[PDB]
Each structure stands twice: as C-alpha cells, then as structure tokens.
Design a protein around this ligand. Sequence first.
Ligand SMILES: O=C(NC(=O)c1ccc(O)cc1)N[C@@H]1O[C@H](CO)[C@@H](O)[C@H](O)[C@H]1O
Ligand SMILES: O=C(NC(=O)c1ccc(O)cc1)N[C@@H]1O[C@H](CO)[C@@H](O)[C@H](O)[C@H]1O
Ligand SMILES: O=c1[nH]cnc2c1ncn2[C@@H]1O[C@H](COP(=O)(O)O)[C@@H](O)[C@H]1O
Ligand SMILES: O=c1[nH]cnc2c1ncn2[C@@H]1O[C@H](COP(=O)(O)O)[C@@H](O)[C@H]1O
Ligand SMILES: *Cc1c(COP(=O)(O)O)cnc(C)c1O
Ligand SMILES: *Cc1c(COP(=O)(O)O)cnc(C)c1O
Lengths: 805, 805
Amino acid sequence: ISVRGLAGVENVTELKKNFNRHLHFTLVKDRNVATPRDYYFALAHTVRDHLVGRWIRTQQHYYEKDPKRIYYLSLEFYMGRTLQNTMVNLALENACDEATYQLGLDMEELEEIEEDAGLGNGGLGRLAACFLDSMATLGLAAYGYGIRYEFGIFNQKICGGWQMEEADDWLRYGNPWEKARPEFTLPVHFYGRVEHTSQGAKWVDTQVVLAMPYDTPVPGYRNNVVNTMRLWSAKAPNDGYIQAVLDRNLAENISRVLYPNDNFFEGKELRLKQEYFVVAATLQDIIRRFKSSNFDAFPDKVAIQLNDTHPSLAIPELMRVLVDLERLDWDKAWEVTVKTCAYTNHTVIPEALERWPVHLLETLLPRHLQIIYEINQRFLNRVAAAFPGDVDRLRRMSLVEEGAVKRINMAHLCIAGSHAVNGVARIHSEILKKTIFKDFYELEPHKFQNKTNGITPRRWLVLCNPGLAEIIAERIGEEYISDLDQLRKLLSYVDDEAFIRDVAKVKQENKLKFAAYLEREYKVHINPNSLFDVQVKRIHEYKRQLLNCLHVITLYNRIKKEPNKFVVPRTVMIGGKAAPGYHMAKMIIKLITAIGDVVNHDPVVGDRLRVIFLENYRVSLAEKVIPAADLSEQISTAGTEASGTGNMKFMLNGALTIGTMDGANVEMAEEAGEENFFIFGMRVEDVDRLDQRGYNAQEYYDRIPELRQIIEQLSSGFFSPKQPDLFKDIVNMLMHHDRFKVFADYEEYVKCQERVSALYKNPREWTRMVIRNIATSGKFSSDRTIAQYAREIWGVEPSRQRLPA
Amino acid sequence: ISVRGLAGVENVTELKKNFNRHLHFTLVKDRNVATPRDYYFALAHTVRDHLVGRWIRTQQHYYEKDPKRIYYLSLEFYMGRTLQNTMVNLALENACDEATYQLGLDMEELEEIEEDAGLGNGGLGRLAACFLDSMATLGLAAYGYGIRYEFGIFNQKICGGWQMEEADDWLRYGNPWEKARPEFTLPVHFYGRVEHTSQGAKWVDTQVVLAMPYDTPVPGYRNNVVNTMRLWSAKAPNDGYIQAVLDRNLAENISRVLYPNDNFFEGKELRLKQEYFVVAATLQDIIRRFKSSNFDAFPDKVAIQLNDTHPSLAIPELMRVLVDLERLDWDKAWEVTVKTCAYTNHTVIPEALERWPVHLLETLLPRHLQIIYEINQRFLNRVAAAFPGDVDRLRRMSLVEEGAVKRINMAHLCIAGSHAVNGVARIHSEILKKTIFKDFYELEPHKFQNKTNGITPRRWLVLCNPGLAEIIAERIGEEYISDLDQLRKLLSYVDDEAFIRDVAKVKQENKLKFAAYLEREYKVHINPNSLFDVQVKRIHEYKRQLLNCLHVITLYNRIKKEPNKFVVPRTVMIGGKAAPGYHMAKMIIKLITAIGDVVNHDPVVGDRLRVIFLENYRVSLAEKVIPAADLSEQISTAGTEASGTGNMKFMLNGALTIGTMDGANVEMAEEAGEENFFIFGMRVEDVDRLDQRGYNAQEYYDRIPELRQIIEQLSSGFFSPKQPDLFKDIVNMLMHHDRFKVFADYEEYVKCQERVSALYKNPREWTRMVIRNIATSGKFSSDRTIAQYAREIWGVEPSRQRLPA
Ligand SMILES: O=C(NC(=O)c1ccc(O)cc1)N[C@@H]1O[C@H](CO)[C@@H](O)[C@H](O)[C@H]1O
Ligand SMILES: O=C(NC(=O)c1ccc(O)cc1)N[C@@H]1O[C@H](CO)[C@@H](O)[C@H](O)[C@H]1O
Ligand SMILES: O=c1[nH]cnc2c1ncn2[C@@H]1O[C@H](COP(=O)(O)O)[C@@H](O)[C@H]1O
Ligand SMILES: O=c1[nH]cnc2c1ncn2[C@@H]1O[C@H](COP(=O)(O)O)[C@@H](O)[C@H]1O
Ligand SMILES: *Cc1c(COP(=O)(O)O)cnc(C)c1O
Ligand SMILES: *Cc1c(COP(=O)(O)O)cnc(C)c1O
C-alpha cells in the first residue's frame, strides 16, 4: 500500500538498530524476557526520536520569524493513540512495518497496546484534537493548552447490563510522547483578599499552587512542522509534620481527574479551580513569549481561542494582569483583550451553560469578581445608550443573573469580551442569532460568525481506513489527504464498474475485520453479510438513542408477526458512555442491553436481527467501528445537536446517513444532494410549531398501533421479566415529559428505515450512492475549518510550505 | 590524579557524542537554551548507559548460576548522590572529567546539581547504603528492598535560630537512576477477617493496595557487578464518581513520606502499614524467584536480613504464606523461617523499641496477630521446659507485654524467629547479652553474635577525599580501595618527612575548600588556620551535643577572663537534624545558634573562636565537611551509642578523635592505640555505679565554679537577652532529670580538650598521630563487615572475581 510511505533499505536498517538500542538502554530488557508491551515502547521511543529534530527547529523557527501566535485553550483534548498517527504524518508507516516484520514482530499487534489519551468527553474534546492536527498541517504557529489529567474519561464496564465506571489510569506504564518541563513551573493563586491602596488594587494573602507543564509534540502532515500541546499538572509548593506533607494532595487534586458531566452544569469548586488553573498558567506563558518577541501590538502577535466557556476566565484574568500588574488604564486594556479573544459555542441547551454562583467566585477569585462587575457595568451602559428605555433588555443581557442565588453567565461574559463569537454549523450559528444570543447580535452584529466543524482526514481516513485511502489514491493521487476537496474528482467514477467493486470490497473487508474483533476481545458473533446499523456517541436524551430503540423493537415485533417473511438482515450497534450522574442515560443503556437479551436469543429471529451494545466507546474503538459501518444514525431532535462530527467520520468512510435536518447534517445533505441522504422528521420550524401548540405524546400513542404495542411491552415487563417495572421511568418520561419529542418523529423514522433496507437490497445502487457521499465529503475536512478560523478570526494566512528539515 | 581511571582518546570521544545525543533526543534541548541542570542530566544518562549492559548480565548470571540470594530488608536507604559514585566504581571519572572539559563544562559544578536520595534518617539508613556497595563489591547475589518515599528526610531551614522543616521533593526534576517496573506490580492486603474453614485459616474481605517496584542499579567497585535495590511504591487498584477517584490518594499515602522520628517510637497506623507493605511485597518476590530457581531447601537459597525490627513482620508473614498458602505444617514452616531470618539491633534505649498495641494489629493484620500468639505460645513452652518454675522469666520473655494496653514486643519476636541476632559493635553486643536480651541469651547462646559496623571506602575516601586517596596510592598502590587493611603499610611512613608534609597539605586544602564553600552558599567567613572542631550527627540527648556546648561556653568565658592570653584558635561546627516532635532536641539547636550570636560578634574574641551550626546536614554535606575536619566529636554517654559510623568516616579522613569509650570508639582506640586517641569520661561500669548511688547534678554544680557560671549565664538570659527564660527547660533538665549525666563528664572533657589544643600547637606531631589513625582504620571498612555477615550468618563466600563484561 503506497500511501504508507517508502520502505528504504537504509531507513529500515536504521529503525531496526534504534529499536534494539531502546529495548536495551531505555527499557533495560533482554530479548529473552521482553513482552509485547516492551516491544511497543521500544517502537514508540524509536518513532519519537524522529520527531525531536523537527520539534526543536520548528519552535526555534517561531522564535526567529516571530509570527502571530495562536493559543487554543480547552479543558479537553481527546487525542486517542499517538503511534500510528505519528508514523502516518512522518511517512514512516511502511518502513516501521518492514523493520518490525524483520525483527519478527507484528506492528498491528504492538499498536493495540498503546493506551488512549482520553482527556475529553466527546465531540468538543475531539474537535480540539482534530484542530491541533490541522493547524500543524497548515503551518500555523499554534499552541494547544490544557490540563494533564492523571485520570481521563472513565473506562466503561457493563455489568448485568448496567454501566460501571472504572478509573482510567492511562499513565500507569508511562507516556513516551510527553516531556516534563519542571524548569518552567509557574505560580497560580487562589482565595485571598483584594487590597485597594493608593496606586491600584492588590490581590493578597493567596494560597499558591504550582503549574508544571508537560509538552507533547503535534506533527503536521509531511511538512516537517511539529507544534506543541502544553498540558499543566498541579504541584504543591514545598513551603503534625506527617499530615502537612500528606495534605499536599489537596493542592494536587486540581489536575487529578477529568469531569465527565457533558450534559448538566454543576458549579463544583474543584471544577472552577481547574478552569482558573489552566487559564492563569497559560496566560503567564503567553505574556512571557510576547515580551520576548507596548501592549498595543499584543493583538497583532497573539490570538486566544476559547473552546466553549470553560476557559472564559481568560478574559478577566487578562484584564487583571494588564490593569493590576502592567498598569494599563482600563479602556486600553479592554481594547487589547477584546481584540485578542474569540469564543466558540457548542450548544444551545440551557442546562449545559455555565452559570457560576457569585458566592463561589467571591471566595475563590475575589479580584476577578470585581473585574467582572466592572465589565458588566460598562457593557450595560453601552446597551442602555443603544436601546434607551429598554429596561428588560438590560436584565436579559446582564452578565449577572438575579434570582434565588446570584450567578455569572459565562456565555455573556465571553460575548462581551470577544471580537468574534461563532457557532459550529450553519443552522446552529443561525439559531444563536435568532434565539439565545439575539440581544447581543442586535447590539454587535459584526461579532457573530459561523465556522462549520470538520474532522482530520489523516486520522479519520488514512489511519483508520488504509484500504479505502489506497483505492482512492490509485485513481486520483495522494494530494487529497491534505486537500480533501479533491475527492470531488471521484464523481467521474460513479459509473466505473471497477471502482464500484473496489469500494464495496474494502467495506466488506472492514466488516469482516470488525466482526472478528467482536469475537476476539468480546466473544459475540455477528453476521458480516447483514447491514451494519450503528449509532455511537455519548448517551443523551437529545441524541435520541431511544428513538433507535423503538425502531429495533418495531423490527423485532414485525418479524415475530410474519416470521417467514423476508427482511434485510441487520446488526444494530449502539455504543457510548453516560455521564455518571445522568440517571436517564444510564437507564437507556440498560434498555439497550435488555432488548439485546431478548432479540439475540429468539430462535425465530435467527441471524436476521442482532442488537449489540458497544462497550467502552472511545477514539480507538471509533477508528475500528466507523470504517465498518453501512448506516450512520444521526437522529437528534432538530435544533439540538450544534453540529456533530461523528456524522462526518461516517460519511468519509463509506456509510450512508439516516438523520434529521440538524447540525451539520444539513450541510452534508446539501453537499451530497438530498437524494443521496436519508432525511426524515421535523425541521426546526416544525418543532417550534409543536411547542406553540403543546406536545402531547398520548396523541401518538393513541393513533399508532405499533407504537402502542411497544409501550405496553415496556410497561408490562416484557424486556424485564424479573423486574416488571424496571423501565417505568422511561415510559413515564416518553408519555408525560419528553423534551425531545421521540414519538413525533417515530412514524417518519420507521418509514425512512424501510427505504434504507430497500436500497441495501441493491448492492450496486447502494455503493453508487456511497461513492456520491465520499466524493462530496471534502468540505468537512478540519483543514477547511481551520483555514476559515485563520483568515476570518485570527488574522493569519495558512501555509502548506514544507519546513527546512 | 591516577585513581580516577584513564582518559582514553576514543573513550572520551564516545562520551562526548553520547552526551550530546542525550541532550538532543532525551532532554529535547538546544545548546543555546540548555542550563547547568540540563547538562547534569545529559551527563547522568550518559553514565547510566554504561551501567545497563553490566546490570542486565549480572542479573542474567544469577539466574544461570542460581546462587544463594541475600535479601536486605530496610525501611531506610540513605543513598546520597549517585553520579560520582557510579563514575568511581566504573572507572569513568577522569574520562568524564575530560569529556565535559572539552565540551566547555565543569563536572564538579554539574555534580552539585544532583539531589540527594535521602531515604533515611541517619546511621541505620546509611549503613544499609554502605552495605549495598560492599555486597556488590564482594560479588554477593544481594538485593536491597525498601520503600520509594516520594518525600525523604525533610530539608532543614534555620529561621531565627530555630529549625524549620521543609518537604524534600527530591523527585521533582526526575530520577535518572531508577527504572519503573509497573509490569511487576504485586497485591498487598490490609484489614479483613480470618475465616477458619475445614482445611486451614483464610484471610478474607481485605482491602488491596498495589506495590509497584522501581529498580536502581548498585555497581560494585570495578568488578563489573551491578546488583539491584528494589523500592516499592504504593498504587491504588483501578476498581460520587469524582470523590472515589480522589480517594485513591488514601492508599497511595503509604509510600508518601519517610517517618523522621529516630528517637521515640510512635505506634502510628500509617507507619505500621509501611512496615507490612514492604514486607508483604518483598516476600512475594523472594518466593517467586525461589520457585523459578520442597521448601526444605528454602534456607539454602534464601537469606533475609532484618535491619532493626522495622521489617519484623517478615517473620509472621513468611509463616502465613508457608502455612496458609503453601500448606506446610507449622513445625516445618517454623524451621524454615528461623533458618532464613537474621536480626540486627541498633540501640538499647527503651523509648526507641517497637512495641505495637495489640488493638492496632488486631484491626490491620488479624491473621498475623493470631500467628504471633501461636509463636509466643510455643516459644514460652520452650522457656518453661528449660527453666521450670521460673514464672517471672515467662512474663519477661513473652512477646506479648501486659499492662495499660497490651503490646507486641517486636524485638522479642525477632529473636524467637531468627537463627542469628547481632549487635553492631563489640561493646554493644556484650551489653545486649548482659542486659536487655540476657534471658534470651541464656536460652539460646548460639544465636547471639557481633558484627562491628563499617563504612565504604569508595564513597568515604576515594569519592570525598581524592587528594588523600592519591597521596596514599602514590606510596602503596590502589589495591587498598578494595582491601582497606593495606593501609597498615602506611605506618612505615610515619617518620617520612615527605609523607607528613603531603598529609598535612591535603588537609589544609580541604579546609580552604570548605571555608570557601561556607561563604559561597552560606555567607559566613571562617579562619582556615584554626582547628576545625566538628560534631555532625542527628540531634539527641544521648549524643550530648549539650556537653560540647558547655565546653564552647567555657572556652569563651576563659577568653573574656584573660583576653590577652594565647589560645589555639578554633572553629567549632555542630550540625544535625532534630526529629520534628523532639522538643529538647529543637531547644539544643536554638542554644547552639544563640551561643554563636554572642561569641561570633564579641570583638575581644576576634577570630580565636567561632561557633557555626551546619544547616541541613545530610550525606552530600558530610562528604564536604568530614574531609576538612581536624577533631571528631564522638561524646555519647558510655553505653548509649550502639556503634556510630560517623566516627569511622572521620578516622579515615585525617581527623583525630575525642570521645568516650562507647560503641565502636572502643575498637577504634584499640586498633590505633589509646595513646593516639583522646579518650575521656566514665566507662560503662562507672555509669552503672553512678546509677546505683543516684545521679545528683547539684553536686557538680556546687563543686565546679566554671560549670556554675555557665548555668547561671543560661538562667539569667545572657544568651537570650530578649527572652531571659528561653533556656529554662534546658537548665531544668540538666539540674534535675538528665538521663545522660552531662555534668558527670564535664571536668574530664574540658581537661582532655586542653590536651587536644596542646597537640595542635605541634603541627608535626599532630600529623604523625593522624597518620597512625589513618593507617589503622582498615578494620572499619564495610567490606570487612559484609564478609563476616556472609561467612558467619548468611552462609555464603564473598568473591573479588571480576565479572565477564
Ligand atoms: O461535546 C460537547 N460538549 C462536551 O463534551 C461538554 C463537556 C463538559 C461540559 O461542562 C459541557 C459540555 N459538545 C459537542 O461539541 C461538538 C464539537 O463542536 C459538536 O459537534 C456537538 O454538536 C456538541 O454537542
Ligand atoms: O540510626 C539509627 N536509628 C534510626 O535512624 C531510627 C529510625 C527510625 C526508628 O523508628 C528508630 C531508629 N540507629 C543508629 O544505627 C547506626 C548503624 O548501626 C549505629 O551505628 C548507631 O549507633 C545507631 O544509633
Ligand atoms: O533567549 C533565547 N535565546 C535563543 N533562543 C531562544 C531564546 N528563548 C527561546 N529560544 C528558542 O525558542 C524555543 C521556544 O521556547 P518557548 O516558546 O519559550 O517555550 C526555545 O526552545 C529556543 O530554541
Ligand atoms: O523464564 C526465564 N527465562 C530466561 N531468563 C529469565 C527467566 N526469568 C528470569 N530470567 C532472567 O533473569 C533476570 C532476573 O529477573 P528477576 O530476578 O525475576 O527480576 C531477568 O532479567 C532475565 O535475564
Ligand atoms: C467523533 C467522536 C465523538 C463525537 O460524536 P458525535 O456523534 O458528533 O456526538 C464522540 N466520541 C468519540 C470517541 C468520537 O470519536
Ligand atoms: C555517617 C552519617 C550518620 C551517622 O553518624 P553518627 O555520628 O554515627 O551518628 C548520620 N548522618 C549522615 C548524613 C551520615 O553520613
């Protein structure tokens, strides 16, 4: 396979000797006692060595050229594994494959040993990861800044059909990719009081926590650029004896674990400490670099992108430093701050928005609270001048929300202090301007933008689906890997009998590969000839895994009704983690496994229908299941999924999509053509009209016999014999308080699914439609997304120019 | 200097290239941004590389030959720095010195960057360190097993003349010498209950803590042998969500910090957990290795040495495994256990002996308590049979002590379960048999032995005093470095005018070197021509730093009395850490600094007398001050210092000794000749006669005018103007409840000190006496000590044979 680079004779010879050198000197092992894990580490260190030279000169280059620096602040970076990605970007895959083969090792086996760097929950964290890859590939002087959690997203275990959370001790065996930089440790302050003396305010009597950075290299695609992702780790200062030392933990707990609540905002103190910790340490680094290049030029040399409101404290912290430390006057500092910061929103659902209780900020960050009040005061004076007499607008736009307990709306703070605010899909960005942020849009229209999300074609095509990447390259070259729009050239092959056959062959190979994996590491057997129907993403009511469940039960009931009637065989796979304290989400997981227990053991069904719950869904599993999927389920209620990115991964890998006109689904259908998409359900307008009228689920239950039967089955204990009322909460929610209108889209969903089965019966036409999707997936490359951020927000020009080394 | 090895052309060339390779690939740095610390690490990794090959084959060799293995269990390993020691033992010092010189670096400057591995309190921990060096040098298949404390002995800061404790974060910048071995992690159990079912007892419902090993290489002196020191680190098993993860700390606190109480036993639960933790993990390793070589041969392949009673749980744990797990019958298991274990005692003072409350063992280690009761039962049945009717002997020898709260005497447990029990100096070993362990000696005389302590001549001569090592080698060769008895050949040079001059020259150079250091890193100026009077060791009442203080004040008062009378100039240095909760010890430190504040600023005294308190005494400081000392203070009350080892370090480095006939001082004087030692004070017999009579301090106060004046000065606030009664506790203790009879040895001490000053006035005779001490210090090499342990206790023969690589 040519897209994996050349396997030169002296290159292979060099890799082999460095492999054995590391096994000996680095790992300190005998070839007679080395285990597969030891071999993985020897390979990792060998590949890491190749990154060093490039990493050192890339950073040296930025010091010389002194270009504008882009700082991407995120509390999450869902990186996954690093070995194969590094080989791919350095063009070392075939060489390492040959070198290891000659040493009597299977590189694929070694790659499976690496732990995932799961420092994220899902979409938001993975977007940050794809963005880092694209920024390096486009030659931007970019830095990713976050927290080095000792424990990432929990490993999910399914016990008795229930989710069990297990600590993700990903650093147990060490992390060969990172480099600790203790010499660059910085002070972060907490608590204390604010002294107001003759010349300015002073924040004193604070407790100090040190921030120690760990740097991880981020290689661009074959351009010799290697940027940095710097993650901070918490350390206690060195200044009963025993208890005093043991209490050092308290300070170090700040970077101990990733918060897994991606659905409901909880104003926990530890989370606020994490947010300030990353912001305070990062900003000192930014200013340091700047002073080594008049803060008037600060915005010309620095761009700070806030991934959601999680790092929003960057705004008042920048003000604190400029005003309290650098001594700039307020107006000047505010000008600099606004021109430097930009904010990206990822959801319109209210329960996820950060609204911190004032009493918490009052105790932990007294000076920042004062700064926020001043910002609010000046901002509202602006609103009052623009909309005289509109007192209600004043209360609505305030950064401070009154009521039971006063809270600070962090989204309002971000809009006021950013020169750009963006949604992540066209429909989402429009909804922001028409609803949630309407008042702000009317005040400052120029600030609102759209930047449709994307995914990196390196990890999501070349790395996880080499077979498809190869057959594509055979016909249009390899240039598309860094210019995905070139995939449009494949439309001229839609009638090519050879190509149609190859596309279908690779998909079949991926399905057999995954079906085998399912038995090896999970002992479950599936029919490779069935349609692989998959929905993988975090469990949320808005994502409607429940609607999928209703269809599965419908299919099952129809079979029990007419057993000898032919139906297209299906393997329905659903996977995803539920936030620990999200009761309903945990009940849905139990429902899925319960359905499987019934369906998978019914003799009449045979191998015509299988329901499997994919355990511990994470980046490394996504790389395995996505290339094997036939049907991608993207069925969120219209207006709820900001963008979605998994949808893009499926489109690029040869799966057809069944979904609502929500998030990026709208743009995907626009690019490929609605005829090549399985669209169904209410549009956003329909949802609003239903809300005006009032959603009454009982209506659908009374008019749809098939739906009624399912609800009765759930209620009577058909799927829970030993515990008849096990799913009472689910039924109760669907019937009386379903914010996401599951029943409203049921009929159209089922009908649409029938059209999917009909097309699958015609192999040739199914594949031709697949080609039309792959061919038009170009717009969804994160390289396109990053280019827009660069030109329209950060003010820099991307570069595909190879670096000097 | 020839004893530093050869600096070959291609050897130097190789070191240089590997140095730059590590700076680039390992540290990931620019030569334009590298700091001294970066250079130190590059050098360390370069030297470490040379250890690897030898380390791997040494361990491979033991697997092949399968010799009897020696396991040295200690909760303390006071290692100090590792770089220079490694170079010395590998004969790479001159080569590295040349290589670094050519790179434009000063190797001495780089060596000062390394942190000390301070995993010990003092003598006991440092003995373990010297023992590891000697066992490797003598070719024994030995393993050091302990705990990898994240925080070693605290760094001592002197604030306002008071000791302040600062956490010793020695791993902050990383430890290049160790190699984590997560793949060899083992389970350690705590709490739980004991089930008694049909076939044997069962320990169930326990809480598990994992023990992760870290291995550090221990190189022998130029024999290519590299043994291992394996230190265990505590890890929590992976099986509110957030709080559950944060609570993992609780389990990991076991290996967090070294207990600094080397004076008073405190039955703290955390300390007991540490003791079992090291024992449980170590024993699994021992058995594993054994089964890979009938437990009847266990004692022929394994020897376990217990450094004090700290790891005494090894006895009942070995029984637990043999009986409960391997299913051996009690008597057989006990036979194996006794033949495998040996115990070393380090003190006769009662407050330091471990006597664990039964209720603590009952909760934490229920099965071990049962085993201890059974051991006690069977042991006492033996005593009853040997001494029929002696009921009092029964209560005295019991492992269980009655009273307020029942406790387990760990020393009694060690004697019952060991085939050998030894003291650490002849006088100490005799005292054990006549007093503290008299009953046990009468029951089993064959178990009691003596093994006089020693120090390694590599670190304590070659490494810290190259100048002296060189002038010695010039005349008798270099063979003495691994056969210290050869120093006796120097007696033929006692009248050699050339040698006398060189010995005196090196001492003068060391004093100027130390005097300079005192100003550089401490800004205090001293007179290099004065007699360097030094007492460095942990602060304890029994060590009598107070007696030294009384002499200093006496000297000061005599000068104020006759200012224009000539007196031999002196620089009195006292250093050492005080256990955190040892009030009296902390008061003595304050007293020393207070005396300095007065004496050091008195115009009349001039540079005739200076009192300096050496801050943060530790191994690296000992290596600096000892070679610069003229007079070694070893003045413990006769019968209290088991052996002492600092005394041996001073003797080997050209200092004369003033001390009591206590511990090893007795043997040192015997070897060098009493005429070449400044002996004074009560012998052990005198102390007992005084106790019979009753020690009344008032008697000395009334009969000695000079002493009375000092006490009155302390009481009146002469040394504490602002706080007149600051030292009331000290005076009160000296006058009414001094267990160590400070006043009783005052007169003889002062008189002896006068004879010291008299000899110092005759440079030539002082030096000749010095030569007689150095020449007879051979017996105190730890190589001699280890050879005796090997032959008389472990049953193995030492070997000076170079290894094959
Ligand atoms: O993944 C998240 N959000 C979180 O994971 C999250 C984590 C911690 C929180 O406190 C709140 C949300 N949002 C997701 O970010 C993706 C990239 O823009 C979008 O495509 C998805 O539509 C959106 O739901
Ligand atoms: O150093 C100690 N003891 C401790 O450091 C200690 C540490 C923790 C404890 O719980 C009790 C004692 N003992 C010392 O061990 C040396 C080597 O045998 C002897 O030469 C000294 O005379 C003796 O006092
Ligand atoms: O003062 C300096 N002199 C020379 N090079 C420097 C200096 N400061 C930074 N650099 C270079 O710039 C890189 C960027 O470091 P950073 O951005 O501060 O982490 C460093 O690794 C050096 O190559
Ligand atoms: O099963 C085995 N086969 C070959 N060599 C072994 C085996 N077990 C241990 N060794 C060798 O013995 C050394 C001792 O390992 P340890 O004493 O168990 O830590 C290992 O590094 C290997 O060189
Ligand atoms: C791409 C990805 C996501 C986001 O999926 P959506 O379906 O857009 O919610 C979540 N988790 C993982 C591991 C991913 O790879
Ligand atoms: C040798 C040594 C000791 C033991 O000294 P003694 O005088 O025998 O108590 C204590 N601390 C350090 C750092 C040592 O090097």
